[PDB]
Structures are given as C-alpha cells and as structure tokens.
From a paper:
To gain molecular and mechanistic insights into the important functions of dimeric α-catenin outside the cell junction area, we determined the 2.8 Å cryoEM structure of the human Δ1–21 α-catenin dimer bound to F-[name]. However, the finding that the amino-terminal domains are disordered and therefore not in contact with the α-catenin FABDs is functionally important, as it makes the FABDs readily available for binding to F-[name] and thus explains its higher affinity. Most α-catenin contacts with F-[name] are formed by the second last two α-helices of α-catenin (residues 772–841) with two [name] subunits. The regions corresponding to the fourth (residues 785-804) and fifth (residues 811–824) α-helices of the α-catenin FABD interact exclusively with the third subdomain (residues 145–180 and 270–337) of one [name] subunit. The remaining α-catenin FABD interactions with F-[name] occur predominantly with the longitudinal neighboring [name] subunit. Such intermolecular interactions include a portion of fourth α-catenin FABD α-helix (residues 772–786) and regions of fifth α-helix (residues 834–841) with the [name] DNAse I binding loop (D-loop). The most carboxy-terminal α-catenin region (residues 862–870) extends to bind the longitudinal neighboring [name] subunit. Interestingly, the α-catenin carboxy terminus engages in intermolecular interactions with the fourth α-helix of the FABD helical bundle of a neighboring α-catenin molecule. At our 2.8 Å resolution, we can fit the amino acids clearly into our obtained Coulomb potential map, which shows the electrostatic interaction of α-catenin K797 with [name] E334.
The transitioning of cells between migration and adhesion is modulated by α-catenin, which links cell junctions and the plasma membrane to the [name] cytoskeleton. Outside cell junctions, α-catenin dimerizes and links the plasma membrane to F-[name]. Here we report the much higher resolution (2.8 Å) cryoEM structure of human dimeric α-catenin bound to F-[name] and the 2.7 Å cryoEM structure of F-[name].
Numbering used by the authors:
A (entry chain A), B (entry chain B), C (entry chain C): 5 to 374
D (entry chain H): 710 to 804, 811 to 871
The structure:
Amino acid sequence: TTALVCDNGSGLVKAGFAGDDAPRAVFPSIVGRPRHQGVMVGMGQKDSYVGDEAQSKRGILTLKYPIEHGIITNWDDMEKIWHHTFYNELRVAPEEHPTLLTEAPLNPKANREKMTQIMFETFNVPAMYVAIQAVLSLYASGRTTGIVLDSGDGVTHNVPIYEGYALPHAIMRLDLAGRDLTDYLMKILTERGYSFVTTAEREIVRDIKEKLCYVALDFENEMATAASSSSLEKSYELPDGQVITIGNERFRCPETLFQPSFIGMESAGIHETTYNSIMKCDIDIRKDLYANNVMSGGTTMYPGIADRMQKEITALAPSTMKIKIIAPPERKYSVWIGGSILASLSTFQQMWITKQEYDEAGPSIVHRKC
Amino acid sequence: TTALVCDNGSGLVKAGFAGDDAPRAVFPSIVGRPRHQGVMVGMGQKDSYVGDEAQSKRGILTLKYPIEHGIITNWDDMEKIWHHTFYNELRVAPEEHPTLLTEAPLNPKANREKMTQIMFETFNVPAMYVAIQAVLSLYASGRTTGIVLDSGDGVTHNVPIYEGYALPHAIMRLDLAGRDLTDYLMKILTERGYSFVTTAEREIVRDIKEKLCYVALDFENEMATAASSSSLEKSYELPDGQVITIGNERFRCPETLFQPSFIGMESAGIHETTYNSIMKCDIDIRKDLYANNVMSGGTTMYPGIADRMQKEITALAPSTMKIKIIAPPERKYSVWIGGSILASLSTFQQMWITKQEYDEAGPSIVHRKC
Amino acid sequence: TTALVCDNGSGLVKAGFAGDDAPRAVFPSIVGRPRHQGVMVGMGQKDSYVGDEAQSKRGILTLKYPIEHGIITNWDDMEKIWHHTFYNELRVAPEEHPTLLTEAPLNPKANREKMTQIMFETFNVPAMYVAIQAVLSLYASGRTTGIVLDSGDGVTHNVPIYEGYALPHAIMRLDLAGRDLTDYLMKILTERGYSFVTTAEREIVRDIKEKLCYVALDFENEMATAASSSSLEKSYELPDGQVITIGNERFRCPETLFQPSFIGMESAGIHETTYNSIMKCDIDIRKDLYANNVMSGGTTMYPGIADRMQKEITALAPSTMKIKIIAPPERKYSVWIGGSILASLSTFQQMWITKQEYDEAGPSIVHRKC
Amino acid sequence: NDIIVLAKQMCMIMMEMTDFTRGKGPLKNTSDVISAAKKIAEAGSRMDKLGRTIADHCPDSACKQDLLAYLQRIALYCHQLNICSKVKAEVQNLGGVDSAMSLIQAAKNLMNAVVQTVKASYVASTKYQKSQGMASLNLPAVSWKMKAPEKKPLVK
Ligand SMILES: Nc1ncnc2c1ncn2[C@@H]1O[C@H](COP(=O)(O)OP(=O)(O)O)[C@@H](O)[C@H]1O
Ligand SMILES: Nc1ncnc2c1ncn2[C@@H]1O[C@H](COP(=O)(O)OP(=O)(O)O)[C@@H](O)[C@H]1O
Ligand SMILES: Nc1ncnc2c1ncn2[C@@H]1O[C@H](COP(=O)(O)OP(=O)(O)O)[C@@H](O)[C@H]1O
Ligand SMILES: [Mg+2]
Ligand SMILES: [Mg+2]
Ligand SMILES: [Mg+2]
C-alpha cells in the first residue's frame, strides 16, 4: 500500500519508499562480470555481480553501466539492476507496491515504453509512473516556480517551471555530465604520468574526482595560480598505496561544464544553457526564473559550482535582475526526495498507470498518462 | 643549416637529415652493460655499449631499453643513446643542426620538457621541435585527411586528422605494441619446451617474431587448420645451431593486437579502437576517415594485418562505407619520412623552438610552441 | 572409490590418498643403476633401484632424476617411479583409484599430455587430473586469495589468485630451486677443500644444505660477521666419519634465491619476482595480494627465509601496505595437502578426466579439462 | 526458521573465533580453534542441505543460480576447514596464532558465503512462495527476520 520510488540514474540507483525522507538503497548502477580464469572449484559459479557487489570485487571484473546518457542500452543488465533493487536491497515484493520511476526529458520513447513493459510484465507491479527528474527536483526544493539544472553521471538538463506549468519548448538537454568529466580526468591525468585504463581504474578516477576536484570561480587566475605556486596540489592514495598528486586537474576537470570544448563538444556551458533556457521563456516569468535556479544531481556537488554559476549568469543577465542559485546540501538526492513527495501525495493517487490500463492500451499508455 | 630528424621509438632509433628520403642511422635503442667477470686486462674498460654495439656483444651484456611505452624511463641511458646518435652514427655536431624529435600523444609532459632541456643544454642544439608521430605518418603518406594507426615497440595510437585539423578528443593511445607481443611470444614458446629468459634471448625471440609471425585473416579457422595439419609449422635456427619449430604461435602472437585479453589486458583490439576513434569524430568526416586508414610503424608489418584490419573495420562500419586500409611498403619509416618532410618545409622554419625562446621561458615553452 | 594424490616433484614424490592429511609415501624421485662390477652370483640381477632403495645403495649406483626443472626428461625412469609409487609404496591397484597429479605452470604441453597417456594406458586409471601446484598450495592454506611462491627441487613459481580467480598473465616461473642451490653449494664447498663430485656425494651435499644452511636477514653484515669471527661455523660428519666445517657457505647458498647472479643467472630474486608478479595484477587486488604471501615447497624451508622475504617485499612495496608472509610449518607438503583437499571435494567429482573422455579425444583432452 | 537460526549460531561461533583473534575470548589457544572450526564446518554442511532443499524447490532460470553458486562456495570452505584442522591437529600432535589465522580466514570466508546463501534463500522463497514445493517448506517471508533497510544519510 506504500509506493516505491526508484531513481534510475546513469551512475547510481536511488531506491526507497514513498513518504520517507531519504533513499534506503544507494548503490552503483553497474553489472560486473569476471574477466579472469576461475581456478578454484565453486568460486566461479557466480557469473555476474550487481551494485556494491561489483565495486567490492571490481579487481577481477569488467564493470558495465546499463545506462549511458540516460538511455538504457543493456536491457538484460538493467533488468538485473532492478531485480537487485527490489529483492536484495529493498527486500520487498514488487507486485504489492506501486513503483515511481524517473527519466530525463527529450529521451527516446522506447526507453519509457520498455520500462513500463518490464515493470508490468517481469515485476508485476500493481501500478507505475515515470516522472521527469527536474520536476521532482522542484518538488523537493519546496517550490512551484524555478528553473532546475539537474546534472547526473549521464545527462545535464534544464527545465523551467512557473507556477507548476512547464515550458517544454525551453527544456534543454545536454549529454555532458559526471561520466564525461571522469573520462576527461582520466585523459588529463596522463600528463602527470598516471595511466588509468581499466573500468575499475575508471572507478578509482571517479573517486579522485569526487574527493579532489572543484570549480574555479575564475579559471584563468586559477591556472596562473597553479602555474606560479604549488599551493593547489593535493595528494591521493591509490588502492595499493601509491600516492598521486594533481595540481590543476582539480579545477580543469569541472571546467568542462562551463567550457564543453575541453572534451571536443560544440555546445554551450551550463551557465549559457541556463540563460538560453530562461530567455526562451515568456518575458513575464524570467524574473522569477532568475531568482530560483535550483541545482540538483551529484555533478552539481563540486565545491564552488554555485558561486561560479551565479557569477556567470549574473554576467549574462541584466544588471537589475535577481540572480539566486539554490543549491541545497542534500541536492544529490533531490530527485528522489521529490519523487517520494509526489508518490505520497494524496492528489497523485489517480495518476498512477494501473495494470488494467496497461492491459487495455499496451506500453503506449505511458506517453499519455505521463 | 640542415635540420636533423631523430625518431626516438621505444625499440629503434631512426635518425637522419631533413630533406632525405630515408634515415641514415637505424639501430636498436638499447644500452648494454657487461654482467660477467672481466678476466683479461684492458678488455673490460668499456662499461657500456649502445645500439648495434650491444646487439653484437649481447651474449655477455644485460640489455636495457631507456624507453618503455614511449616514456623515457632512464634519462642517463637515453642521454647515451642521443650522444651515440649524434656523434657515432650521424657524425654531426649537434649545435649547428636544428633537431626534430617525435613523441607519442597522451604522454607525460615531463617527458617532452626533459627532452627539450637535454637538447638545449647538453647538446646545445640551435633549435628543436617535438612532433606527434601520427601527424608525421600522415605527412609521409601524402595526405591531409585520414586516421593513422601507428604501432611501434612501445605504444599503439590512433589520431584522426581531417583537412589538417586533428580531433584531439578522438585520439586513442594503447600501451600494447611490439614489445608486448615479443613477451607474449616468449611466454607461449614455453608450450613447446623453448625457454628464452635472458634479455639477449628476448632479442632472439624478437627476431623469431619478425621472421615467422603473421596475422590470421580468420583466427578460429587458422587454429583449426594448425590443429588438423602441420602445414603452418616453420623452423628457425638459433644462434648456436638448434632448430625450433612453431606452428600456431605464428598467428597467435599477433592476434594479441585484436584480442588484447591474450595478455590479460581489458582494452579493445586495434580494429575496435580504430572504429571507436572514428565514431568520436564528427559525422561529416567519418566517411573520409573510413577511406584513409593509414597504418605506420613496425608492428603493422605483419603479413596479413591490413587484410584482417579491413575485414574487421568493414564488419564494424556500415555496409555502404568506403573502408580502405593504407599500408605503404615503407611504413616502418613513415614517422621519420614525415618528420623529414616537415623539417624541410619552408613554412615550418618559424615554428622551431629557438634557444632564445628556451632561455626566456624554460622547458615549458614546448607545450605552447608544440 | 578413493582418489589418489601423487605430487611429482623434481626431487621428491609425495603420494597418498585423498581425504588424508599427510602423504603416505615420501621418497626421493631418483632411479639408480649399478656402476661397478658385480662379482657375486645373483647379487647383480637387479639392474635398477627406485626411491629410498637407491639412496640406501647409492654408494655403488649412479643416481638419475627423471625430472629436471619440472619437466619429465626420462619417460622410462619416471614410469618406473610411478610403478614404484603405486605398487611398492602405496600398494594399491591403480585401475580402481582416480589419480590427481600436479604440474608447474608454463611447462611444456607434451609433459602433461604424456602424463595423461601414461596414466590411462599403462596404469589404466579410471580417471585423472593435472592441477597447478600453487593453486593446491592456496587450497591447503585455507584461502582463496593470495600470491603463492612455491619452491621445489626444480622450479620456483608465483601464481597470484584473487577470490578464486587466477591472473595467468602475472604468473612467473623461475628455473632456480633446490637442485641449483645444491649444485652451488657443491661448487663453493671446494673453497674449503671439500670435493663432492659423484651423484651420491651430491645427495650428501643436499643433506648438508638441508641441515646447516639458512637465509641471512642482511647479507652484507652476515658476511662481515663471518669474516670477523668463527661463531657461524658449524660442523657436519660425512658418511665415513670425516668432519667438515662451513662458515659462510651456510647463508651464501640460499642467497642465490635473492641474488640469482651467484650462479650466473640474469633473473631477479624471489622477492623481486614476487613484487613484479603483484604489480602485474589489477591495482584493486594488490593490497590483498601483499597481505597473503603464501610460501610452499621445501626450498622455502630455510631458517629465516620468511623474515628476509618480508623485509625485501616491504622495501619494494609502498609503506602503507600490509606485507605478511605466510609460511606454515608444514609447507613442505602444502601442494599435497591441497591436492587431497581438492580431490576429496564434492564439487570436484565432475571435473575428473574419465577414461571415456580420453578415448574420445586423445591425450589432448587434458588442456581443455584442466 | 531453521536457516536463520543455523546461520546465526554459526555467527556466534565465528564471533568466538574473532575474539580469539583479538586475544581475549572463550578460546585459550589453537586446540579450541581447531574444535570450533570442526563444528562450524559441520554446521556449514547442515546449511548446505538447507540450501539444497530450497534450491531443489525452485524454478530453473530463477534465483536458484546464485543460491547454488553460494552453496558451492560453502562446500569448498567447509572441506578446507576440515582437512586444515586435521593438518593443524597433526602438526600440534607432532611438535601458533599464525596457524590459527588460516582456520580463521577459512571461517570468515565460510560465514560470508553463509550470509550470501541466507539472503539468496530468502529471495528465492519470497519470490516463489505459492509455487508448489515452496509451500511445503513453509518459509513465508516472515520466518525470515528481515529488518527494513535503514535510510541513507542525505549529507555525508
Ligand atoms: N562530491 C562530488 N563531487 C563531484 N561529483 C560528484 C560528487 N558526488 C558524486 N558526484 C558525481 O555525480 C554522479 C552521480 O550523481 P547522481 O545525481 O547520483 O547521478 P545519476 O542521477 O545519474 O544517478 C557521479 O558521476 C559522480 O561522479
Ligand atoms: N617484419 C616485422 N614483422 C613484425 N614486427 C616487426 C617487423 N619489423 C619490426 N617489427 C617490430 O616493430 C617494432 C619496431 O617498430 P618501430 O616502428 O621501429 O618501433 P618504434 O617506433 O618504437 O621504434 C619492434 O618491436 C619489432 O618487434
Ligand atoms: N629443511 C630444508 N632446508 C632447505 N631446503 C630443504 C629442506 N628440506 C628440503 N629442502 C629442499 O627442498 C627440495 C624438495 O622440496 P619439495 O617441495 O619436496 O620439492 P619438489 O616439489 O620438487 O618435490 C629439495 O631440493 C631439498 O633440497
Ligand atoms: Mg539523477
Ligand atoms: Mg615509432
Ligand atoms: Mg612441488
């Protein structure tokens, strides 16, 4: 009788029960398969590991992400991820709880349709729903007006909402997020002689990026400071005890969000994308969109990203405007918190896609109910 | 007044004069030191041998390569290699000729900086330059568009260039090349009872690999053919007259380029790496990249590697595409030939790093001039 | 219905029944043949002695080892060794017990194939299996993770195993073991005037080495101590009552494991080989490999070899690492104990090579079943 | 629930083994550790049949694959402990915390495999309850003492 809320990100699964204030399962959205020779009898029967199971044993596994850029690419590994989520992590029976799922905007329709079908036919959920992650972030922030920038492992999206009305023509999606920054950091770590190639070493580099990287308020003076001194250099100890030092890779990696040309993309930075999304909205709502810049997702968790974000948008916007960037401390789970707010809402209970409706109208019911 | 062109590979030094069409010095990039007891007076004064000097006497020496994987690891032995190159092999005075040097991409910056410093301060070169070996291969092939797959003793790299513009985000480096194949062949020669352990015996195995190994167009039917018959077995006479026979080690050793998991690496084969590099490029240049697959380096000199290369990329690419693999007969020296083309160019003469610029800006001038 | 476990080492045969905790037959793996004139009638009919039979009479015999370096070189003498093992020592009928055999890694394939053929066709065993001795050592140590250094009469090998998965690219074999140390001790015993030349005197020197030799924790201070004093000198009584004294031959002979250049080999010591094997493994398993350094075999039985082993690996590894050397008191039989653990396993009983499978697929079945 | 009580009493044994590892517990030296290893291996074999039955009452392409994987791990760990304890017993009889480490490591491995087998069995029974055969086992997702998972910390 209590709904489930599974936030399937590209990088992490955030799962829990509607009504709660925090997910109960947060594990990597990876499936690992052994890549070496099993030489002991019975030690190689398990052919696949999911979640923290795979990060624990990643030294003998090949780690694969079922989701790239917010689109599910492996539907047998994602199916394993969902089975893990329901049975090993949450330990529920899916056919008694309605499940709320999340999806990025401007995403293929087959993604949503196959999620609907997998739920209703492999997990027999009584009902389900697919919600847009930026609307859920605005739910969690306690607002009904504001432009939400959500950055995850796979996609960065801006959705401007005013008085509960979205402006879908001003929604901007950008396939540049945490995994692209991890790849860029692996690339520019080679300048110091550090070679991380394996998927496990990619997880190591993701850890380095989360612990050491930050966003420079002014990039050029930070480059000058790093060149002049060694005050910005920090060390990091690898899983086998080697120590690496990185000086300007710390703020060069997150700068790819504001200069996507670092990784060869032609698009505009997240500040320019946010401004361009605000200026596709009606002139009468732009003032309230400027003052409510909700940032959610884990790629917005760099130290200094809100200050740089506000500086850049202030440069772009008129000088009489009211630029505020809203970055809650818990914004790494804003999508899940908003999903649990919505799934527990009393007025939402007629908005589930029941299995009767699915049986009438096939998986295509999800484009018209959601 | 004539520039020098030194192609410092991991395995061989290719040195000569710009404008020429072939290097004048091609010797192994090794330094040997005696490992036994000198018992005759005056016969043990020379404590180090370089190049063919060491391969001649390798039966009493320990051979060391100053470069592994394209990074110079011993800076006193590499310094000896360069002294040999300039004074014993080329017989020039380095302080009158500008020197063009080559380096792999995605390589530590300290490598390039210390090469600049060693040139300008130990050899007093009037000017120098460090060029990327794949750009030089494209120079030598007479093109300005194409993706270069350069494999040497230490590194395999893919650089896609279109109309003279490189796409640095699509450059792929893979630390799997001739020396890894030599090591794999030493490993799998033990299945027949042949034990080559010493560094000199590693040179013997490198010779075996160069003379007898080839790339199977279809690996599984070649394994079946080798199992069924003895038609693929060839003999080889060791330096002391013993004869060894190898049947499927001939095409198993080069297969590690297409199945890097043979030596325990997780990466993708050179065909998959080439395709992945083409698909990181802009969609409008992919057709011209497919049709110009320049292969350079000595590890691309296996019989049948271009046929297998084209078969695999044709399998990966769309069926309407124009897959051509360009493998010149002289591709073992494409990097040097392109370096001599570039160093002799009239428009290149303002692109040298003069010693005045080095004196102004330290070794760090090489990242901004090159 | 009970399996046999024969550990064919280069020096000793360890044979027994699976399930037991100790071999029931441990005899030298030698065949002796008389070399003098038989002058009494009927006293010279026996033309060959095996095992302790030959060590008893070694004063009139020429002792030969069928196995050098882990490869069987005499297939008629090894066949005698196996006949002795089955019929005189164990006193079983081989055609009712499956037999587990052991073999070193990176060993010729014809060795394993001919062992399979000899079993199935001369001894008619119902089934057989060939296991790697380091995996068996890890079985006996009660672990599924760790790097095993196994030293026998013929070969020293490192096999890193993590969670039951071997990393075959990091396996290192080194043809330096107890017999090479015995030969080196015979060589350096001549400095004191003791000349042991015959094969029987080689057995005497092996006894001297087992009783008196040890591993110096720091070689140079031990050489200084032996030069300054006579505190390290110990005596030994020869079979005919002569007494020999050796001072620094006691720790010079085992030092050849850490300085293989003592016997003219170019390879690295066992500490350097162990470290190099650990650093060919994935970075995420190196910490657990450092902490589980299983040492098995009889050449690891020198007093002080575990302390020196840990000191050297601690010097090589990072300072934050967890270096533990695991040297069980019974490690001279770890391979046999692990073989009896495996052959008695319930999940192993479908992994025997039955004689039906051999009849289908020839001796080549052993490379794909094992 | 038989599975839960068996695994949890083995957890009591494995706690006493770690307490000997810390040097202050109900075991004085290696002999007590050898005895504890023997009984934990016996209880592991009992656990092995419990897992066998739950697997045998499960559909083929189901959670029984993971459960059989963990059961094979259990088989090897129990066998390693029994021979290793017999080897350690013989070594003591002939001639050692370092010796205790191998048995304790095998016991840690076995206990981890048993925890994995417990959760796999719970998932198998809950997911396929009113499939026939599982009802006879009478393991109705309540005999399992499964806590609700605790919430994650929003800020770290
Ligand atoms: N403290 C941090 N600093 C920078 N990046 C972080 C931090 N924590 C997580 N990330 C990045 O955020 C991504 C996960 O964020 P999340 O919102 O969970 O993604 P998704 O919605 O795709 O699951 C990961 O790629 C990780 O690299
Ligand atoms: N005919 C051949 N067949 C296969 N491999 C070869 C052949 N000739 C040379 N090689 C390999 O090519 C490598 C040298 O190629 P090169 O391009 O000179 O390397 P580098 O650029 O590192 O000097 C050596 O490792 C050698 O083993
Ligand atoms: N106490 C000891 N000290 C040093 N070396 C020993 C000792 N006991 C045996 N050895 C050596 O170990 C070798 C036999 O070890 P073992 O593991 O049985 O070899 P294998 O596996 O080849 O049969 C012999 O060469 C012997 O010299
Ligand atoms: Mg998200
Ligand atoms: Mg080259
Ligand atoms: Mg042995």
